[PDB]
Amino acid sequence: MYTFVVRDENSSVYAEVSRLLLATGQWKRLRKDNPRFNLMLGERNRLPFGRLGHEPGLVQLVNYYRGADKLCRKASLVKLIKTSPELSESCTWFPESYVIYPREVFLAAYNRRREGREGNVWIAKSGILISSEASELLDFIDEQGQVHVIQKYLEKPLLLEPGHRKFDIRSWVLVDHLYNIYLYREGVLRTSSEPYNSANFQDKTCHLTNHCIQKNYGRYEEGNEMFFEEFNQYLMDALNTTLENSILLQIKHIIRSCLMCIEPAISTKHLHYQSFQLFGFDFMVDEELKVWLIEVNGAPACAQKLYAELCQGIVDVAISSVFPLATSIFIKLHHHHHH
Amino acid sequence: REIVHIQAGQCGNQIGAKFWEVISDEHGIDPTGSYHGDSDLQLERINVYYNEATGNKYVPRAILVDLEPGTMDSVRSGPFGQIFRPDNFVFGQSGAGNNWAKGHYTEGAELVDSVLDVVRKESESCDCLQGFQLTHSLGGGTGSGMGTLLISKIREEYPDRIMNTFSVMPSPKVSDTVVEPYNATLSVHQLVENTDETYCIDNEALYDICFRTLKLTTPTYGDLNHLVSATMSGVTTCLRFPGQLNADLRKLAVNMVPFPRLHFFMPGFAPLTSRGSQQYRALTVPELTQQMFDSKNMMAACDPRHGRYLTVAAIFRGRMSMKEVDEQMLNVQNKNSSYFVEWIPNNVKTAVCDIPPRGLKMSATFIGNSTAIQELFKRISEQFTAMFRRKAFLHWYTGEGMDEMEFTEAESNMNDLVSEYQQYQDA
Amino acid sequence: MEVIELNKCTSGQSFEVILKPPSDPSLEEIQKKLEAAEERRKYQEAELLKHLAE
Amino acid sequence: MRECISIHVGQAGVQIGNACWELYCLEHGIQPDGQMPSDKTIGGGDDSFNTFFSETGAGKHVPRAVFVDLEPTVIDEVRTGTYRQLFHPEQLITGKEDAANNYARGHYTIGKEIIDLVLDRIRKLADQCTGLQGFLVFHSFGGGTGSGFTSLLMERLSVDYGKKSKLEFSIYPAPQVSTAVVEPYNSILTTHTTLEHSDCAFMVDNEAIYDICRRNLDIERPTYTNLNRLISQIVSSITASLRFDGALNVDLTEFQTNLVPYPRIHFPLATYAPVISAEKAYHEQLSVAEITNACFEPANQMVKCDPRHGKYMACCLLYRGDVVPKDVNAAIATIKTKRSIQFVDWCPTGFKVGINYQPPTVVPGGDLAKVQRAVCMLSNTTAIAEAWARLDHKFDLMYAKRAFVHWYVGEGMEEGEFSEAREDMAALEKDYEEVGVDS
Ligand SMILES: Nc1nc2c(ncn2[C@@H]2O[C@H](COP(=O)(O)OP(=O)(O)OP(=O)(O)O)[C@@H](O)[C@H]2O)c(=O)[nH]1
Ligand SMILES: Nc1ncnc2c1ncn2[C@@H]1O[C@H](COP(=O)(O)OP(=O)(O)CP(=O)(O)O)[C@@H](O)[C@H]1O
Ligand SMILES: COc1cc(-c2nccc3[nH]c(-c4ccc5cc[nH]c5c4)nc23)cc(OC)c1OC
Ligand SMILES: Nc1nc2c(ncn2[C@@H]2O[C@H](COP(=O)(O)OP(=O)(O)O)[C@@H](O)[C@H]2O)c(=O)[nH]1
Ligand SMILES: [Ca+2]
Ligand SMILES: [Mg+2]
Ligand SMILES: [Mg+2]
Ligand SMILES: [Mg+2]
């Protein structure tokens, strides 16, 4: 009989994990401030990591990796990628980005771009702004009042037909207490329902692919959610390639690169408590079938049809591996090249 | 750190004499008072309960009190009656007639100063007196009425010493008189104000254990007192034997009593054994741990699952693995965490004593400060109100000078104590 | 990796290696606090004796 | 040569003092009767070991130490133990009834009855000093004496010895070995009153020592003897620079200079390696690189916490045994590339290293094996504040319902002191986050 507490009532994924654990007949939910738990489904902010691992007689596990936030925040990600030699400023799969607070390095980037006779249109961070002249860009940063990064807006995205539409790929990644990196079988493609209009960036619906900002909506697929089998079938018919060869190979390389970089900082291998965490990686693919990393979310929400399967995978892979009870949906990412 | 023991009334002297019988055997003292044990570990803390007499003999620091002479003569007639000091026998000739007013206000008042002179005599010969323990019942007149008057007067002379009681609660299943709810309610009001720790020994629970568990169809008082004796020996094990803990009465009270009025403990013992019945199979540490927490092993007729544990003290006796004890004790708290208040972290303390009690290789004693003890006080209050609403049997008490308003106040204070337990059960 | 201030003796050595550069109450008050707590004790004790007197 | 006086308060401070002074005698060659055959200057001297030992005309070396307990059972074992003749009877001070795990009883009720005597005995040791530098105070957080009396003593020492440094060795409460449910109360109360009066405090979490004894010494249920002998090794590592020849941490003032850049953040984290069992048959002696890398494993720390999620303000490496600077620097270079070591921006990223060539000494019959090299790291990291968060949270749970508070008010303490102490701890936590956490 294992015990757990719930401290993020707004988590749809771990609400489903709570139901799955109780339905096993071998897990019991305690009051939220009961310290005698085996598992903590913790809050999103100021989680008391310092209080874990000090209960004699209890192996304790938590659904969050302390320090993983420096991957899951816009400004911190650019800092991590540019300063970590494992990734470097020469990193090929991250768009050119610059941290600016309300830089002479970013100003010298557009100064070489637009005055160099090339494309130049970027994006904001944290409502966003897509502009070609930096004057509008920086002016909005000071009006907003938060740290922002200026990132190259992929002017040449891969456009799904029929529709000339834009789109982003969401990958769910589970990292267990042993720091196994598990890529969930099922991704999802959040889609834009409007024709990508390079002429007018004020049209927010054909440039931003957030499921919320798409609120026109649902013409081509339900909920603007295209999944891997159909998208694989599309690239086969349209582009004579597969999802695995043209996209997923890069995605698996980016996921492993990011998490292997921060592993020494966040691993709980020899810690008095243990950590797992579910991540949400968001990718962009251009028309050259090159995959770009846009951001990664530390508390993602699943797709409706995939909730039952992914949350069941979290239990088997992350929770029952530590707390055992009385073909796999994940792809374990590992690579050992000798050089 | 010496303790002064006092037994008052029939029940107090009967369980008191049998307590001295049990621990004298544990420490190797014969009825004459000579030491004939095999280990010097029995004498390391012998001074807590015994004085050293001429001839290197050990005399209990015990005072025997009653308003009736007969029961104290039976004590002197008892197997270990000659061990006690003759000047510590303080008795009247009236008898209290199961009347709290007679014990507290009239007959007992005549004798109480004589008892305090023996208490003073015994305390003056103490290097560092820690406090007093009283054995008595609450249903009669002497141990109830005169015992609580004795407690009040002792607190007046020794206000910084610990006051400890083993108080036997009345039950209709083992009932001598209809006025026992009156005597108990008036006594509980006193104990709430003037004791630091009270072990609630419920005659209802003692009977139920003898009948349902020990398979005794007709339990004598001797059967009931066999459970009381084993329990009293258990809860005093730390005081009487050297161990890793150097515990005393005040440190126990500080750790067990989060609020001054909530100092009534549920005692528990495992394994439950019948008198004379031999135990061939020793319990394991998991068995001891689950029995000592079982409701069937509680000496107070309360359901622990109906309340929450504020604090718990557990005492293991015998040769066993401290690792296994720690694991089993942690297992009980971790698997039953809902029944321990979360606002008192780490509220369970465990001690292990290498010397087991007589006739057992392994044993465990439970001491719980649980809010479920309100069930015991609710039951006494209900039996009190059933008669007080018609002022039934009150003339026995108004003939000794008491007024009905004193009954109302005692009833009110105990209902207040019940509501105070309820407040922390929901907190 | 600059090794600074290397001092050596027959008992051992000590040094500094730098990787990167940067970027009361008086006696009377105590006696007053202790005496104020004893006064609260003797008041609380006097209330008990007054209560016992009643 | 500047003398140091050791003060041991309560059971924990006394018993740890016993094991420390036993280790000191073995390290310096002083026998239980106090003689030191290697000391050729009979009756006096200004050697490094004279910082902790005075000398009689009979050549007997006497610890500059006072033992205080409000109850006599513990110190009586010192009066009758192996080192009975080592201490003058005036160095051992006992009452008759203790503080009963009550800070208020140790600080106010009982402490006021004995302090003037304790200060008088301390003055006797101070008067035999030609240049006293300060005090080393050993005590527990959880005990009534270790918390209540120590804070009272620290206040008076500031008055009587205004310019003297005061260092603490503090035992942080752990349920695995604790004696009282109110130890979170006593810990916050004593830290609040002592904070301004301590220049440097080395916290030892009994939980960390307990687990190290279980994991690395293969002891199923560690006793106080197992814990205190391991604590003494760490304490000896920290004080060795005061008792032996060297250039680093030669006086108590240097501990504050090297480890404590800000006054209130004066709790350095100690990490020790290697801890190897005597019962281990085949052993592979660990190199300079392996013991230095072990300093950054939380399992070897005196307080369980994660320095990767805090910031460093100072780092000292105290080696004993076969260690040369070349290997230290090579080990540091390798470690810096693989470990998460971030200093604050107003501190240089550097390690202060001290090396004593004599390997650590072990008590005959002890649990620790002899090793050719050992190291104790003293780092001032904000990660130690995790221990404050754990303690303050347990404080909050009990105090919200005023559980056990009547025991303290009954001894003359006021309820306002609880909130005063807790509100100071809240400020201390804010200081640690401020310094160590980036936005
Ligand atoms: N590491 C270690 N901790 C100890 C030792 N003795 C006691 N403690 C710890 O110290 C804390 C408080 O207990 P004590 O120091 O014994 O109590 P005290 O200072 O004597 O104060 P009072 O007895 O209440 O007057 C507890 O957490 C104990 O676990 C010891 O020998 N070694
Ligand atoms: N360099 C870039 N180039 C082109 N489009 C970009 C872009 N960066 C962001 N976008 C667009 O913004 C949309 C949302 O991305 P972003 O990560 O900034 O918002 P978000 O934080 O709400 C994602 P989630 O919360 O689901 O993890 C993407 O779908 C993409 O179309
Ligand atoms: C275990 O049983 C006894 C112990 C003691 C005892 N002695 C000294 C310090 C003691 N702290 C404690 C103690 C008690 C409860 C809790 C809960 C959390 N932490 C605690 C510590 N109990 C102490 C005394 C006894 O009799 C007088 C005993 O028998 C009845
Ligand atoms: N357990 C137990 N209870 C007793 C014993 N003798 C009396 N009682 C109980 O005590 C109450 C009567 O009190 P008693 O001691 O006889 O009155 P007193 O002598 O005037 O104080 C009744 O509730 C009895 O059930 C005994 O030997 N053992
Ligand atoms: Ca000399
Ligand atoms: Mg986001
Ligand atoms: Mg009778
Ligand atoms: Mg003590």
Short mmCIF file of C-alpha atoms in Angstrom, two decimals, chain D residues 13-284:
data_model
loop_
_atom_site.label_atom_id
_atom_site.label_comp_id
_atom_site.label_asym_id
_atom_site.label_seq_id
_atom_site.Cartn_x
_atom_site.Cartn_y
_atom_site.Cartn_z
CA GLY D 13 27.86 18.87 23.57
CA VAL D 14 29.47 16.96 26.44
CA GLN D 15 29.55 13.52 24.79
CA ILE D 16 30.82 14.99 21.51
CA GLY D 17 33.43 16.86 23.54
CA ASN D 18 34.56 13.56 25.05
CA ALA D 19 35.17 12.03 21.63
CA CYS D 20 36.86 15.19 20.30
CA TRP D 21 39.29 15.46 23.21
CA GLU D 22 40.02 11.73 23.03
CA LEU D 23 40.90 12.23 19.36
CA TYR D 24 42.99 15.32 20.17
CA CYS D 25 45.03 13.31 22.69
CA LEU D 26 45.74 10.55 20.16
CA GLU D 27 46.67 13.08 17.46
CA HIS D 28 49.13 14.91 19.75
CA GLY D 29 50.44 11.90 21.69
CA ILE D 30 48.90 12.87 25.04
CA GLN D 31 48.12 9.90 27.27
CA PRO D 32 44.92 9.63 29.36
CA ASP D 33 46.90 10.75 32.42
CA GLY D 34 47.84 14.00 30.64
CA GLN D 35 51.56 13.44 30.00
CA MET D 36 53.00 14.23 26.56
CA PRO D 37 56.42 12.54 26.19
CA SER D 38 57.18 14.34 22.91
CA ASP D 39 56.85 17.73 24.65
CA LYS D 40 60.38 18.68 25.71
CA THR D 41 59.44 22.09 27.17
CA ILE D 42 58.07 20.93 30.52
CA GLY D 43 55.67 23.18 32.41
CA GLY D 44 54.82 25.53 29.55
CA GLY D 45 55.34 26.57 25.97
CA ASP D 46 53.89 28.44 23.01
CA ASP D 47 53.58 25.54 20.55
CA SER D 48 50.58 25.11 18.25
CA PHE D 49 49.03 22.39 20.43
CA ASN D 50 49.12 24.86 23.35
CA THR D 51 46.15 26.57 21.69
CA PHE D 52 44.02 23.75 23.13
CA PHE D 53 46.18 22.45 26.01
CA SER D 54 47.72 24.16 29.01
CA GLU D 55 50.63 22.66 30.94
CA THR D 56 51.17 22.08 34.65
CA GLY D 57 54.54 22.05 36.38
CA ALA D 58 54.28 18.25 36.51
CA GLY D 59 54.27 18.15 32.69
CA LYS D 60 50.57 17.28 32.51
CA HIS D 61 48.68 18.71 29.53
CA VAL D 62 45.22 19.98 30.49
CA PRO D 63 42.49 20.76 27.93
CA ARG D 64 41.31 24.37 27.82
CA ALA D 65 37.75 23.13 28.18
CA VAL D 66 34.69 23.49 30.40
CA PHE D 67 31.82 20.99 30.48
CA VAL D 68 28.37 22.24 31.54
CA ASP D 69 25.16 20.28 31.99
CA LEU D 70 22.13 21.16 34.12
CA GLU D 71 21.99 17.47 35.15
CA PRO D 72 24.91 15.32 36.31
CA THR D 73 24.60 11.82 34.77
CA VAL D 74 26.51 12.60 31.57
CA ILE D 75 29.39 14.61 33.05
CA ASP D 76 29.70 12.07 35.89
CA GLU D 77 30.87 9.57 33.27
CA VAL D 78 33.61 12.06 32.38
CA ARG D 79 34.47 12.35 36.08
CA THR D 80 34.84 8.54 36.19
CA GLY D 81 35.89 7.73 32.60
CA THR D 82 39.16 6.97 30.85
CA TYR D 83 40.23 10.64 30.91
CA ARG D 84 39.27 11.32 34.54
CA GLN D 85 42.63 12.89 35.42
CA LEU D 86 42.77 14.89 32.17
CA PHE D 87 40.33 17.54 33.45
CA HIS D 88 40.48 19.59 36.62
CA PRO D 89 37.29 19.15 38.70
CA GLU D 90 36.48 22.85 38.27
CA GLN D 91 36.21 22.24 34.50
CA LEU D 92 33.17 19.96 35.00
CA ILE D 93 30.02 21.83 36.10
CA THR D 94 26.70 20.11 36.81
CA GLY D 95 23.33 20.93 38.30
CA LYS D 96 20.85 18.44 39.69
CA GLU D 97 17.72 18.69 37.49
CA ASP D 98 17.87 19.43 33.76
CA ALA D 99 15.82 21.67 31.46
CA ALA D 100 13.46 18.82 30.49
CA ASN D 101 13.74 19.47 26.73
CA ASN D 102 12.39 22.98 27.42
CA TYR D 103 14.28 25.97 26.02
CA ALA D 104 12.58 28.29 28.52
CA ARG D 105 13.69 26.12 31.44
CA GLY D 106 17.30 26.05 30.27
CA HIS D 107 17.45 29.73 29.33
CA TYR D 108 15.40 31.37 32.09
CA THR D 109 14.40 29.21 35.06
CA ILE D 110 17.45 26.99 35.60
CA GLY D 111 20.00 28.91 33.52
CA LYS D 112 19.82 31.99 35.73
CA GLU D 113 20.80 29.86 38.76
CA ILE D 114 24.10 28.60 37.40
CA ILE D 115 25.37 31.00 34.78
CA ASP D 116 27.42 33.24 37.06
CA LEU D 117 29.23 30.12 38.28
CA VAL D 118 29.88 28.92 34.71
CA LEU D 119 31.21 32.35 33.71
CA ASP D 120 33.43 32.23 36.80
CA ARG D 121 34.92 28.88 35.77
CA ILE D 122 35.39 30.16 32.21
CA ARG D 123 37.22 33.16 33.67
CA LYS D 124 39.62 30.78 35.43
CA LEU D 125 40.62 29.30 32.06
CA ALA D 126 40.73 32.74 30.43
CA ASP D 127 43.09 34.06 33.12
CA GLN D 128 45.65 31.41 32.13
CA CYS D 129 45.63 32.70 28.54
CA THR D 130 48.27 35.16 27.35
CA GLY D 131 46.20 36.09 24.30
CA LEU D 132 42.80 34.40 24.25
CA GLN D 133 41.26 34.53 20.78
CA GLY D 134 37.84 33.03 21.48
CA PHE D 135 35.60 30.06 22.16
CA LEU D 136 34.35 26.87 20.51
CA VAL D 137 30.85 25.99 21.76
CA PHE D 138 29.47 22.45 21.36
CA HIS D 139 25.74 21.95 21.89
CA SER D 140 22.57 20.44 20.47
CA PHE D 141 19.67 22.39 19.00
CA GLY D 142 16.96 20.16 20.46
CA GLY D 143 17.88 19.82 24.12
CA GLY D 144 16.63 22.16 26.79
CA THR D 145 20.16 22.80 28.04
CA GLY D 146 21.86 22.72 24.64
CA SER D 147 19.38 25.29 23.31
CA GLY D 148 18.31 27.37 26.30
CA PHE D 149 21.50 27.60 28.34
CA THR D 150 23.84 27.92 25.34
CA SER D 151 22.02 31.01 24.05
CA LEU D 152 22.13 32.53 27.53
CA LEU D 153 25.85 31.74 27.73
CA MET D 154 26.56 33.18 24.28
CA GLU D 155 24.95 36.49 25.26
CA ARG D 156 27.06 36.75 28.42
CA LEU D 157 30.25 35.81 26.56
CA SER D 158 29.66 38.71 24.16
CA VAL D 159 29.43 41.02 27.19
CA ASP D 160 32.45 39.62 29.04
CA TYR D 161 34.65 38.91 25.97
CA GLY D 162 33.52 41.55 23.47
CA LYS D 163 36.36 41.07 20.98
CA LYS D 164 36.67 37.27 21.24
CA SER D 165 35.59 35.09 18.33
CA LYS D 166 32.86 32.53 19.00
CA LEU D 167 32.44 29.39 16.91
CA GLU D 168 29.63 26.84 17.19
CA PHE D 169 29.34 23.11 16.58
CA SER D 170 25.58 22.56 16.53
CA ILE D 171 23.71 19.24 16.38
CA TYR D 172 20.61 19.65 14.18
CA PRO D 173 17.66 17.48 15.26
CA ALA D 174 16.76 14.28 13.43
CA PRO D 175 13.75 12.08 14.31
CA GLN D 176 15.84 8.93 13.85
CA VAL D 177 17.71 9.69 17.11
CA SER D 178 15.80 12.62 18.68
CA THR D 179 14.55 12.72 22.24
CA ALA D 180 11.84 15.42 22.20
CA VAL D 181 8.83 16.37 20.08
CA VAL D 182 9.48 20.08 20.81
CA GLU D 183 12.99 20.12 19.32
CA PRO D 184 11.85 22.34 16.39
CA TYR D 185 10.76 24.89 19.00
CA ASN D 186 14.09 24.78 20.85
CA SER D 187 16.05 24.96 17.59
CA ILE D 188 14.37 28.13 16.30
CA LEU D 189 14.47 29.76 19.74
CA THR D 190 18.18 29.14 20.28
CA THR D 191 19.18 30.10 16.72
CA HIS D 192 17.34 33.42 17.06
CA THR D 193 18.96 34.39 20.37
CA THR D 194 22.43 33.11 19.40
CA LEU D 195 22.51 34.41 15.80
CA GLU D 196 24.05 37.80 16.62
CA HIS D 197 26.56 36.25 19.05
CA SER D 198 28.07 33.53 16.82
CA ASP D 199 30.74 34.29 14.22
CA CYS D 200 30.72 30.85 12.57
CA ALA D 201 28.55 27.79 13.21
CA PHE D 202 29.09 24.28 11.83
CA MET D 203 25.74 22.49 11.76
CA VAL D 204 25.75 18.69 11.93
CA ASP D 205 22.45 17.04 11.01
CA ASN D 206 22.12 13.83 13.03
CA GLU D 207 20.23 12.41 10.04
CA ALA D 208 23.27 12.83 7.77
CA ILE D 209 25.60 11.25 10.34
CA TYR D 210 23.13 8.44 11.00
CA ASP D 211 22.89 7.52 7.31
CA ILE D 212 26.66 7.76 6.76
CA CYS D 213 27.16 5.33 9.65
CA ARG D 214 24.56 2.98 8.16
CA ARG D 215 25.77 3.17 4.56
CA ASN D 216 29.56 3.45 4.84
CA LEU D 217 30.27 1.89 8.26
CA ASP D 218 27.69 -0.92 7.85
CA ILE D 219 26.10 -0.26 11.24
CA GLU D 220 22.42 -1.21 11.29
CA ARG D 221 21.52 1.01 14.27
CA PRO D 222 24.20 3.61 15.05
CA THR D 223 24.64 4.62 18.68
CA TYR D 224 25.78 7.98 20.01
CA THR D 225 29.28 6.48 20.21
CA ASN D 226 29.30 5.72 16.47
CA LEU D 227 27.97 9.18 15.61
CA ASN D 228 30.22 11.11 18.00
CA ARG D 229 33.42 9.40 16.84
CA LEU D 230 32.58 10.34 13.24
CA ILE D 231 31.68 13.89 14.28
CA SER D 232 35.01 14.16 16.11
CA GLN D 233 36.91 13.32 12.92
CA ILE D 234 35.17 16.20 11.16
CA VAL D 235 35.65 18.54 14.13
CA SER D 236 39.31 17.54 14.26
CA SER D 237 39.65 18.26 10.54
CA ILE D 238 38.23 21.75 11.11
CA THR D 239 40.30 22.57 14.21
CA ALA D 240 43.54 20.94 13.00
CA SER D 241 44.74 24.26 11.54
CA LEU D 242 44.61 25.74 15.06
CA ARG D 243 46.53 22.90 16.75
CA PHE D 244 49.23 22.21 14.12
CA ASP D 245 51.73 24.18 12.07
CA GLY D 246 50.28 25.77 8.95
CA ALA D 247 49.45 28.91 7.01
CA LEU D 248 45.66 28.51 6.53
CA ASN D 249 42.98 29.14 9.18
CA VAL D 250 45.54 29.81 11.90
CA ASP D 251 43.20 31.80 14.18
CA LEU D 252 39.45 31.92 14.76
CA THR D 253 39.28 35.29 12.97
CA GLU D 254 40.48 33.59 9.77
CA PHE D 255 37.49 31.24 9.85
CA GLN D 256 35.16 34.23 9.57
CA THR D 257 37.34 35.89 6.91
CA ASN D 258 37.63 32.77 4.76
CA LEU D 259 34.18 31.22 5.26
CA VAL D 260 31.78 34.01 6.25
CA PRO D 261 31.49 37.09 3.97
CA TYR D 262 28.17 38.09 5.54
CA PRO D 263 27.48 37.95 9.30
CA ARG D 264 24.07 36.24 9.39
CA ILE D 265 25.01 33.70 6.70
CA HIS D 266 27.62 32.02 8.91
CA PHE D 267 26.67 28.33 8.59
CA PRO D 268 29.26 26.60 6.37
CA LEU D 269 28.51 23.13 5.04
CA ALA D 270 31.00 20.41 5.97
CA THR D 271 31.60 17.43 3.67
CA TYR D 272 33.99 14.63 4.59
CA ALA D 273 35.57 11.76 2.67
CA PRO D 274 36.48 8.96 2.84
CA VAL D 275 34.41 7.17 5.49
CA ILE D 276 35.54 3.53 5.36
CA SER D 277 34.64 0.75 7.77
CA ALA D 278 37.25 -1.05 9.87
CA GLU D 279 35.43 -4.35 9.20
CA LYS D 280 36.07 -3.97 5.46
CA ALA D 281 38.60 -6.61 4.46
CA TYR D 282 39.68 -5.71 0.93
CA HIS D 283 39.88 -1.94 0.50
CA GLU D 284 41.09 0.16 -2.43
#
